[PDB]
Amino acid sequence: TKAVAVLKGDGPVQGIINFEQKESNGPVKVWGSIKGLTEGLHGFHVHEFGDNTAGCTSAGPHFNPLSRKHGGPKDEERHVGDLGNVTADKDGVADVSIEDSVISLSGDHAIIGRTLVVHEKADDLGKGGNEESTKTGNAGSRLACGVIGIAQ
Amino acid sequence: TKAVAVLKGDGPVQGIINFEQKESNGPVKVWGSIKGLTEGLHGFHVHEFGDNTAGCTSAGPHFNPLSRKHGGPKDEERHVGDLGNVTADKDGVADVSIEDSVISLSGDHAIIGRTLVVHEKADDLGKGGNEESTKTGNAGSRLACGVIGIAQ
Numbered sequence A, B: 001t002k003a004v005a006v007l008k009g010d011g012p013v014q015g016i017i018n019f020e021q022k023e024s025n026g027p028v029k030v031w032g033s034i035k036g037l038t039e040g041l042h043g044f045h046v047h048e049f050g051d052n053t054a055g056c057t058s059a060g061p062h063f064n065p066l067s068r069k070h071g072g073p074k075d076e077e078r079h080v081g082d083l084g085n086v087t088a089d090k091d092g093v094a095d096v097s098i099e100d101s102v103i104s105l106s107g108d109h110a111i112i113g114r115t116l117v118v119h120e121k122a123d124d125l126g127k128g129g130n131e132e133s134t135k136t137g138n139a140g141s142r143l144a145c146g147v148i149g150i151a152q
């Protein structure tokens, strides 16, 4: 019903993101803060593995159990892990307060034990007009990540 | 089913611990290495929460879903999270190789999304002769921890 991810990297990006799901067939509330970001949009995705053995690279690809194309969170055609973009202000702080009905904290699409990643660049939401757009949204390198763990 | 925990803290203690469970009702193999430790025994436990918001303290208590008293891994009376001690050599390296049939990587009591912790002192296995012994094993402070994540 409740989880948390503490985001850390090799640079200045750090944050804490909370997840809450009241019902198993209900939406997941996702909220928290990330700091140390460049002003503007940054890709925000759940990746497949909760493996930090080689930094954020070890988390592997976007969590995509249904083998779909990359999209935005509002799209029917999207990865389970496609949570779009977070927005950082001029002081580099991104306040996050979204709701999603595709991710879950239980069942086959459970994101517990997987990795939340915030990216270098904006997610183009599959609308970038190149092959990479429908794979990763061209969001670039992984600035910070954290395993999604069970919280009180 | 496979998992991994990358142990980090505020000091020299770091390690990678792998988990593998070939069958959902079979033993979990736990192996890896921890370095930066003092020579001797160090408490080695799964804690309830995969929460690193305030360091290793945020992981909360020993994972104990069946509400049992603290013990050693061989004891019938023990917490699910009671994996005993790891032994560090004169170089400060603990090679970990154990099998456990109480913990699981799947089901309602799965340890995926929870926290693996290595401790300052030896776990006394509930035989230290005081109140704290039968609660936590008197293993002292938490030197390093990591959320247990899904691995490839």
Ligand SMILES: [Cu+]
Pocket: A043, A044, A045, A046, A047, A062, A117, A118, A119, A139
């Ligand atoms: Cu991502």
Ligand SMILES: [Cu+]
Pocket: B043, B044, B045, B046, B047, B117, B118, B119, B139
């Ligand atoms: Cu512990």
Ligand SMILES: [Zn+2]
Pocket: A045, A062, A069, A070, A071, A078, A079, A081, A082, A135, A136
């Ligand atoms: Zn995606």
Ligand SMILES: [Zn+2]
Pocket: B045, B062, B070, B071, B079, B081, B082, B135, B136, B137
């Ligand atoms: Zn215990």
